[PDB]
Write the structure tokens for this entry.
Amino acid sequence: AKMAFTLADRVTEEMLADKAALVVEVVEENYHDAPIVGIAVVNEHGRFFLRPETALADPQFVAWLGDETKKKSMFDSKRAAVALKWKGIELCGVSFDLLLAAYLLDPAQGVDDVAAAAKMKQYEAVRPDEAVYGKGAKRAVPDEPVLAEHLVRKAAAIWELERPFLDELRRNEQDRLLVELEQPLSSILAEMEFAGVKVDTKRLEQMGKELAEQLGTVEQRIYELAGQEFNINSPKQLGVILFEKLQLPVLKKTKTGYSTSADVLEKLAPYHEIVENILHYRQLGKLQSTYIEGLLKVVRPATKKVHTIFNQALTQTGRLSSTEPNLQNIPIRLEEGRKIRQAFVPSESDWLIFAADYSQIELRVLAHIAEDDNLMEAFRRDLDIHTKTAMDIFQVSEDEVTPNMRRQAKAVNYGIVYGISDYGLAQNLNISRKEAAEFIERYFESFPGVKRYMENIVQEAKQKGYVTTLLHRRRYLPDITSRNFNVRSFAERMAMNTPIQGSAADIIKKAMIDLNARLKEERLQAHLLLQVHDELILEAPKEEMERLCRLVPEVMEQAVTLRVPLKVDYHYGSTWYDAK
DNA sequence: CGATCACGG
DNA sequence: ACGCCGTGATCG
Ligand SMILES: Cc1cn([C@H]2CC[C@@H](COP(=O)(O)OP(=O)(O)OP(=O)(O)O)O2)c(=O)[nH]c1=O
Ligand SMILES: OC[C@H]1O[C@@](CO)(O[C@H]2O[C@H](CO)[C@@H](O)[C@H](O)[C@H]2O)[C@@H](O)[C@@H]1O
Ligand SMILES: [Mg+2]
């Protein structure tokens, strides 16, 4: 169609109205220190394209960007706010984010550009980003006339789409979810990303050297026990060595061949001691490629900071994800890998890392939603839920529960409600299927409210076509009412899990908002560095630690009010490792 | 490029 | 058929 706009040479007053759609275009997927390629503004007065050299050097435009009373509608304002922070420019007054609006309406659409959001409301006057920029190796900023139209069309779409999106969100009881939760969170995340996390690169390099030496050792020992050289990192080549050369029993097959999973290898340990060396090599290899080589590749060598990106509009359940680097999967469960955490350090001298974590938040959320008398009682009385379950499924008194029995009970606790089978429980814990089935019966008899939640939540999903979380986030499950046992089954387990995992996401998000408010309120230097699903990581001057110790846990625990209390553990020290 | 494997929640 | 949600390295 025909859409008129001003390809402007200079900023003018009518471009600085107090309500506008604004596009600050960053074409690099990773927007940290990335170029801004163009600016579009659409308001009551018209449509404008501005060259970034010009607009970002203009004191009036920069003031307008920074003024919170001048309201902007955008798509992915976090991308813009961060790219602008790298250029030394503050962005304020973002009142609508089309990306977050589309995400809330349906995460399954995987909306990742203005065009994809526009399609939800049959708005077609805008091209997909991939069509304008090209895919893969063809990725390129087009000629200025083409770029300018594309950006103005994006700004025009946001301008037209705000009301229809807000109208549907309001209808879904998700309007406060957008304006009071996700949008404020976006600003908090932008600050966390830009600040970054400081890394001890010398320590990482030292670990890397040693690891390469252990790797070399374990590798040769594997070749020696196998009587051949092969690529150990090739599950397929490893399959041949284990199941053809060594004639080890084939315990599991996939559509592609023999499994060499950690679980299969565990079950093969009575047969040959090689499998235990292979497990060791894989643990070492992971630390090396992922957490040494990977981290050092992205660290900024002049500041020693890593700058992750929290994807706020990706997961189906309302969790965040973290990329380039992922800081939500740094090792903790085994002591060797946990030491990577010593390389995560305060950004200034005399600062400390502070870490706080919800205790068993998903099971507390389950207690609340299911209204199981027995489960609710456990949390109100501050009992250990994993020990209690152990007592119920092993039919023993409390003192008889072993640390191993607690671990098995933890697997039961995080498995049954989400649809684990007796088979799955038997395979995962390497125990008899008959006993696994008894565990499952005893659990349900001990927590009958949980059995009824599973039945009721699946019924609700079938009747409504979606499930909802505590703060009204939705996930649609069109696959749920199918005759196809597998497709229906996978959808049923999503119905069981999403309300629990998604409600836990809602609670921590609200917690981050409340916390930001107070830190700023009491004018502390403390700020957030990271969120890890049910944990918050901060850094602060050491003097601030007696305050954080009282403030952080309280904000966290009172974020929402449930039919059971929420519990938070917290720790500080001179590295992330030490914050335990 | 989709599976496999390992790491976290 | 066989708990859920993620990212990265690596393979063929
Ligand atoms: C280990 C593991 C964990 N999870 C999720 C669900 C919980 C969170 C946090 O794990 P944690 O051991 O702290 O659990 P928590 O209940 O906090 O137990 P602790 O009191 O920390 O022992 O991770 C899981 O889904 N499957 C697993 O096998
Ligand atoms: O800016 C993050 C935001 O952008 C999207 C696309 O709209 O994802 C892009 O950026 C991510 C972070 O660099 C990449 O991981 C992703 O591959 C890229 O498409 C959204 O998905 C995201 O919320
Ligand atoms: Mg825990």
Remarks:
- The pocket of magnesium ion (ligand 3) is lined by residues A 359-360 (CB under 6 Å).
